[PDB]
Design a binder for these strands. Structure first.
Length: 105
RNA sequence: UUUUC
């Protein structure tokens, strides 16, 4: 997919997914487009330090990946995934107040 | 943990 993910259009930033709390030491922009492509058709993807971004054809595909990968385990570390335009409550270094393990036991 | 020498 394309390396572009920073579009600010009133639909392109809602068809985007923010992937915070990412390990980034074992996952790259050539892997996110193979792990998030199962929840929607990716039209762009980028990875950074501690976070990544994925761009879909529409917001529906973003809701499927935010609900399909948030709290999944990558590189042995849980991810914190959310829409790129509707952040939950917190972002920096934290964003979960649950057991973060209720899906593994 | 909000964006690509």
């Amino acid at each position: 997919a394309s390396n572009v993910t920073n579009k600010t259009d009133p639909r392109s930033m809602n068809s985007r997914v923010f992937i915070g709390n990412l390990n980034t030491l074992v996952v790259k922009k050539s892997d996110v487009e193979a792990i998030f492509s199962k929840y929607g058709k990716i039209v762009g993807c980028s990875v950074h330090k501690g976070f990544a971004f994925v761009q879909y054809v529409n917001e529906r595909n973003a809701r499927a990946a935010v609900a399909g990968e948030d709290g999944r385990m990558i590189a042995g570390q849980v991810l914190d995934i959310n829409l790129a335009a509707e952040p939950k409550v917190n972002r920096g270094k934290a964003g979960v107040k649950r057991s973060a393990a209720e899906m593994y036991g």
